[PDB]
Design a protein around this nucleic acid. Structure first.
Lengths: 129, 120
RNA sequence: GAGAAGGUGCGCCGGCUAGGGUGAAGGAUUUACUCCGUAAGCUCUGGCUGGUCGAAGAUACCAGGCCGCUGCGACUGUUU
RNA sequence: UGGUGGGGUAAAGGCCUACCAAGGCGACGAUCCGUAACUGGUCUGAGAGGAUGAUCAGUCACACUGGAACUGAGACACGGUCCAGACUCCUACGGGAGGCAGCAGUGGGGAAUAUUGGACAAUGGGCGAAAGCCUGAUCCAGCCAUGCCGCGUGUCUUUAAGUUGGGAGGAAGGGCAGUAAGUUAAUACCUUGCUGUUUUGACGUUACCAACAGAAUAAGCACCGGCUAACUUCGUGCCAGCAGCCGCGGUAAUACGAAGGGUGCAAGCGUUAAUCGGAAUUACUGGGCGUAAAGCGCGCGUAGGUGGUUCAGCAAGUUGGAUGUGAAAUCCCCGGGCUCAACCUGGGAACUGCAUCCAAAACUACUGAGCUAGAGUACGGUAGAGGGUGGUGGAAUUUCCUGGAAGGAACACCAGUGGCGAAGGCGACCACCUGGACUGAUACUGACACUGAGGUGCGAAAGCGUGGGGAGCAAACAGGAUUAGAUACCCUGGUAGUCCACGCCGUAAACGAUGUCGACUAGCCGUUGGGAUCCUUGAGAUCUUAGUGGCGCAGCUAACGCGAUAAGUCGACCGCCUGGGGAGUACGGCCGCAAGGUUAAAACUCAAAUGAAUUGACGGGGGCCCGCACA
RNA sequence: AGGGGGACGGUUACCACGGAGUGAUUCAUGACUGGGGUGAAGUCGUAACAAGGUAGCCGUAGGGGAACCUGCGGCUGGAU
C-alpha cells in the first residue's frame, strides 16, 4: 500500500524532472500543500493549484532551465520510518546553505534560515537542492 | 537489515579468532622440547629445515621453528617461544627465540645480533 | 518398565468437626406391600488438633529382597 | 503475588507469621546457562563509535572456607569472639596455639615485576586538660631505562658526573614570663585567647651557588629485492638460509651468510604479543541479494513496525527558555612555576546527560465527529487444461484365439511468448456439488489499511507406509554383443512403481536462479479476456482497461542485460548474506517406521575461491573455401 | 520464711557443615573407531572443462571397488 503522503509526491516529480512534462497532478492533502508553498517562495516552482473540489489535487507548475532543470534531487530524510526529529543547533546546511532545508515547526513548515533565527527545530523534511 | 529489523535483532560484529592457540595474550611462553627433527618445505621450493616439537607450560602440543643456523637444543631444552608464521613450512606458527635460556646462539651472526642471539 | 530405586506416617486415649446409609413424631392421597421428611437409635468412612506408654505400635501369625552388564528364546503355554 | 489479624526492624515492607483468596513474572527475552566488580574515565577514532576499568577518586565486595551473633553511636568486625571445616605448628602427651588479598620478605607459579629500609620534621587520624604518645596510612628513601621529558658523549670552553667551599624552602607552633584582655561575686586567683622577646625541633641533607684537574668517564642498534629514491663485490649454489605480502637461493646473488659502505633515530634500537584504525570487512551515519555469498515454494494472519483523508482537542515523542546537577580528577584553552620540557596547579571551557517547571501546536500517537480516493459487498454477463467425484470413449500397442472376446495407462489435432490458481500446479467426452478475479455500470461501507518474527495450514516426483491393481516401459538384475574391463550407453527379458482410498514425509535447477504491496517517469509491434468509441458493410482501426509477450530511450547495471510485469525513482515491512574449504556437516532439540529431513556450530586449513566480459589457444563445435587431400 | 526477677538447666523450631539414596548437567580422559584438513603424491584410473570423446547438473529413491549409473517428476547453468 501507500504509506507516506509526501514522499509519494517528492518521488513523482523527480522522474518527471528527467521526463519532458510540466504540470504534475496527483491527489493531494493539506500536508502536501503546505510543503509546496514554501519552495515557490524560494524560486523553484510556482502556482501549487489546489483544485478546490471533492478529491482535491495539486497542480504544481515546475519551471525548466534550458536543458537540465532547476531541481536535481529531492532527498527524503525523515521518511516515515526513521523520522529525524532534529534540534535548532543541528540543522543541515545541505549544499553549503544553498539547499534551504525545509523543517516542520510549530509556527511554520519553514526553511532552515528562519528556523535558526527564530529557534524551533523538528522534522527535517527533505533536501530541496 | 532495516532499522526496524535492527531493533529486533541487531548486527553482531563477528569476532576475529586469534592466530596462536597458545600464547594466551602473552608475548612469550616457555616450553620443553619433545622432539627435534627434519621437515621438507612446500613444493615450489625445496630444502631441509629443522623444527622442534614442544610441550608448553600450558600443556599444549605445538611445533616451533629453531631459527638458527646451528643449535645444541638437545631433546629436553627449556626453549622460549615467540609467534610468527613461517611461510614455506606448513601448519606451524611458532619460533624458538635465540639466546633465551638454553638456546646457545648462532655462530658469528655479525649483523642482526639482537635477532639470532649474539652478545656485543 | 514400575511395587523400579528410595522415603514418611502407623498403638491407645481424648478435644473439635465434615458427611453417607437406614429410620419415622405426623402430614400430602393412589385412604397403603407409598412419597416427603421428623428425630432419636443403630451403622459406615473421614479431616484437623492435643495427650500418652514402651526398646520397639502393619509389635504376633501372615507378608516382594533389590540393582548393574550380558547370552538364548519374543511373549501365555508344552515336554522326558 | 496480594488481603487483614498480630509478630518484628533505629526506620517502610511477606521481612517474619497464621489463615483467606488465586494471583505474580515473561518474547520490550522471563527462568536457566556461561562471563564480569561497577563508574567518573581510559585507548584508537573525522566523529559515530569500538575496545576498555593497572596508578588516581566515588560506590560496592571480601578477609583460610562456611555459618553465626555479640559488644558498641556505628560490624554481622582484615592484626575480635563463637562454631564447623580444610590446613599448619609447639608439646615435657598434661594441654596448647596460628591465619601476610597490611608493609617488607620467602617459596611456588609464571614471559614478567622492587628494600626483612628512615622518621612521625610536614599532612592526617587515634586517645590526652595540656605536654605529648603510637601509625609499614603518610611524608620520603634503595631497587628497575618500565614509561614520560630534559640532558650529556667535545669545536682551545667544562655542563653533567666527581673534589671542595658555600646555600634558601619545607616550622604551622610548642616551652616560658612577662604583657593585655573577659567570663569573675572577687579582671581576687585559676583557666583561656591575644600580643613582643627569649629557648628549641627537619626523615629525605639537600636542591642550589661558586671554585678546581682535564676532552681525562660516555653510542649503540637494526635494516639497504620492493610501494620506501639507505641500494659494488667477497663466500655459498634448489645447498645453507631469510621473510610481514610478493617472493629470493637451482653458478656474474641489489632478496641468503660476512666484510665494505650508507641510512632510519638515538641510551635506545628492533620483534614477539594485545588493542583500535585503514575496514563501506556487520555499513544508525554508511553496504548488500537475476547470474559473485544471499528471496522461505508460497499463503492465512498474532504481537509488532508503519499507516489515505478534514476540522477541533490533548500535549506522550517532537521545539525553545528557566533551575538543580552532571562530584573532584582527567581532558580542552589562557596562564603561573620548576633555568626548559614533562610535571604542577589557578581560572574557565567542556561534560552532547537527567528529571522538574512554564511557553508552543506544523507534524505523529492518542481522543471525538467525519470525508471517499484504499479496501470490501447487493446486480448479471461471458472467458477460464480452476479442482474433484462417477461414467462414457477411441485408436494403436499389448495379451490371447478363431475379424471378434478381454483390460490397463496417457489422451495426436484443437495448443497458443494462451487461460487458471497465493503457490505447487493442471488438457478425449459428459453431467453433477462447488472457487477467486475481471468488467459493465448502478448501489452502500467510512481506512475497516498493507506488511508481518513467532504461529499456522498448504506444497513436483522417486518413496516407504495401509490396503488393491496390472498393459507398455522401467528403477532391482540376468546374459547378448564391447572394451585391459561394463560394473556403461547399445541387445533379449521383469517384479517395486506410477493408479486408487486415507495417511505420512515437507524434499527441490519449487527457477523468472528475481519477497509481498502501492505509487509514479518516452515509446513502438503482436497477443488474452471484458467494455465503449467507430461511415460501416468488418477485411476490421482507434480507445479503454485487467493479464501475457516482443523491442527500446530516459533510467540503472560489474558486465551480460533489465527496461510501466524494472533489475529506475521511491515508501512501508519481511526473509536472507558477511572469503573459500571444513559444511548444510557433526553434537543437542523436533518430526519420520525407515531412508532421513529441519534448525545449525566451532577445531583446523588456505590467500585466495567466485562473477560477467575480452584476446589467444583448443574442440570427436557448426558453416564456407583452398590444394592429387579423395578415383 | 519467702516473693519478684535473673542465671545455669531441660527440649522446641530454625540452620551451616556432614550423611544416604537416586537423578541431572558440565569438564578431562578412554582401548578402539569414523570421517576431515594439509602434505608428498606410488596407484587403478578419466570423472568434470569442447556435443570432454555416453551433454552436464540438481533433488531423490534405488543399485554398484572408486573418480561413479538407471528410473520418475526437474532444470537449461544446452548447442547444431
Amino acid at each position: 500500500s501507500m504509506q507516506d503522503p509526501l514522499a509519494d509526491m517528492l518521488t513523482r516529480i523527480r522522474n518527471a524532472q528527467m521526463a519532458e512534462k510540466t504540470v504534475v497532478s496527483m491527489p493531494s492533502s493539506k500536508l502536501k500543500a503546505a510543503v509546496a508553498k514554501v519552495l515557490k517562495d524560494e524560486g523553484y516552482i510556482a502556482d501549487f493549484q489546489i483544485s478546490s473540489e471533492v478529491k482535491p489535487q495539486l497542480s504544481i507548475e515546475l519551471k525548466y532551465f534550458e536543458g537540465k532543470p532547476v531541481i536535481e534531487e529531492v532527498k527524503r530524510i525523515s521518511r516515515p520510518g526513521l523520522r529525524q526529529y532534529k534540534s535548532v543547533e543541528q540543522l543541515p546546511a545541505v549544499r553549503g546553505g544553498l539547499g534551504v532545508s525545509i523543517v516542520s515547526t510549530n509556527k511554520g513548515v519553514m526553511t532552515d534560515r528562519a528556523a535558526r533565527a527564530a529557534g524551533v527545530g523538528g522534522e527535517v523534511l527533505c533536501t530541496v537542492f | 537489515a532495516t532499522i526496524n529489523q535492527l531493533v529486533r535483532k541487531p548486527r553482531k560484529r563477528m569476532v576475529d579468532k586469534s592466530d596462536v592457540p597458545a600464547l594466551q595474550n602473552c608475548p612469550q611462553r616457555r616450553g620443553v622440547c619433545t622432539r627435534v627433527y627434519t621437515t621438507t618445505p612446500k613444493k615450489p621450493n625445496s630444502a631441509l629445515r629443522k623444527v622442534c616439537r614442544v610441550r608448553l607450560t600450558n600443556g599444549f602440543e605445538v611445533s616451533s621453528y629453531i631459527g638458527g643456523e646451528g643449535h645444541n637444543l638437545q631433546e629436553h631444552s627449556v626453549v622460549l617461544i615467540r609467534g610468527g608464521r613461517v611461510k614455506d613450512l606448513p601448519g606451524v606458527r611458532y619460533h624458538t627465540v635465540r639466546g633465551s635460556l638454553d638456546t646457545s646462539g648462532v655462530k658469528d651472526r655479525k649483523q642482526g645480533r639482537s635477532k639470532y642471539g649474539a652478545k656485543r
